[PDB]
Amino acid sequence: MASRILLNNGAKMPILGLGTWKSPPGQVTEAVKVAIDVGYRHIDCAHVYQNENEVGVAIQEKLREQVVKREELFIVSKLWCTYHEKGLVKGACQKTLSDLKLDYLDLYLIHWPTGFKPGKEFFPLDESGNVVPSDTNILDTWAAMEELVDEGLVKAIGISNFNHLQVEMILNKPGLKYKPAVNQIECHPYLTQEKLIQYCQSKGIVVTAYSPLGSPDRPWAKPEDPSLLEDPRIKAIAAKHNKTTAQVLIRFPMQRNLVVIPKSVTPERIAENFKVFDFELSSQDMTTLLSYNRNWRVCALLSCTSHKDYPFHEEF
Ligand SMILES: NC(=O)C1=CN([C@@H]2O[C@H](COP(=O)(O)OP(=O)(O)OC[C@H]3O[C@@H](n4cnc5c(N)ncnc54)[C@H](OP(=O)(O)O)[C@@H]3O)[C@@H](O)[C@H]2O)C=CC1
Ligand SMILES: O=C(O)COc1cc(F)ccc1C(=S)NCc1ccc(Br)cc1F
């Protein structure tokens, strides 16, 4: 398959990237170095993951080593919820740039559509455990993102975890200057997201699938939850193709015209997960994988569910 997708800002985005949530700071530098050595050209990062400095050490080493040129890398980060304030967005972006050792990002996303009270805590709580919101809405935060493009800090802007109506809000913004380039959402065979994906694709937004393996290392996993990697129906499709279950799970979103960002810190798996450009799932395989949808989410959070902009009340 073609390895990059054209964005609505005119840049090309690699369809396979390396995820970094939960990658320990003492392991992620090596993970990113190995990833770049074996061909990855897209890294998915975020301030809230608390490891951007260590990601940046890897990136800088590979640039210094002339393993890859900066123009060939596609580096993504995300604005955390406590920085949805007009006067805080630029500084948040600049902190991420400083940590990653970069002078621009290829793509900067609004991490979640919910703003939280600014401060040191990533999840400021009231005395009863509810997150404390910000009064600032997704449209004013979007205008702040647009300024980053115009100041040269980021090449593209986008959104993450926005539902159908929140995407529409952005597209219908009075005076919209730049459309979102990407909506990054959870997507895998048990949460197939057909409705949201068709909406975004019909509007020219590229969708990035996160947690494509079902995030088995999520901190709130329960021993009894469904497991994609262990699903014998998926194992059977993999065996037919002489591939691993992970490779099928990565190829699946690629054939839906999605970008996909599997996470690993294991060098052998980092390599395995990149070897997904030499086989094709049939249409029947694709439809079969889609049939496994159960509307099951890795990423949700009870403490945030009353926030007026919490995204997963809406059907899609
Ligand atoms: N925008 C948002 O709100 C969110 C963005 N994301 C992004 O998406 C990325 C991917 O999602 P994530 O939730 O991390 O989970 P993934 O679905 O990518 O699963 C990661 C887990 O799968 C394991 N794994 C990786 N490759 C294989 C393999 N070949 N065989 C077996 N196990 C494997 C990893 O183990 P190990 O590392 O030990 O090898 C790790 O435990 C995140 O890291 C982050 O960058 C994720 C959630 C939310
Ligand atoms: O968020 C990620 O990328 C991966 O997950 C996380 C990654 C982190 F580094 C810290 C917390 C999260 C959580 S708990 N995320 C879920 C979540 C956060 C905020 C809101 Br609004 C709803 C929600 F569901």
Are residues 75 and 106 in contact, defined by beta-carbon separation less than 8 angstroms?
yes
In ligand 2, the atom with minimum distance to the C-alpha of 49 is: 9
Angle CA 49–53–59, to nearest 5: 110
Residue of 18, 21, 184, 312 to mutate, ligand 1, most atoms within 8 A of C-beta: 21
- Looking at domain 1-316, what is its CATH homologous superfamily? NADP-dependent oxidoreductase domain (3.20.20.100)
**Way it was determined:** X-ray
Q: Which residues are designated catalytic?
A: 49
Residue of 213, 245, 269, 273 to mutate, ligand 1, most atoms within 8 A of C-beta: 213
Distance, CA of 80 to CA of 282 (rounded, Å): 39
Q: What is the number of other CB atoms lying within 10 angstroms of the CB of residue 218?
A: 14
Closest CA to 177 of 203, 157, 207, 154: 157
Name the closest-CA residue to atom 7, ligand 2: 49
- Tell me the helix, strand and coil percentages in the chain, rounded to 5: 40, 15, 45
Answer yes or no: is 62 a known binding residue.
Answer: no
- Give residue 267 CA to ligand 2 midpoint distance, Å: 25
Mark out the alpha helices in the chain (DSSP H runs).
25-38, 52-64, 86-100, 138-150, 164-171, 194-202, 232-240, 245-254, 267-274, 283-290
Rounded to 10 degrees, the C-alpha dihedral 244/248/249/254 comes to 140
Domain boundaries along the sequence of the chain:
1-316
Is 300's C-beta closer than 6 angstroms to any atom of ligand 2? yes
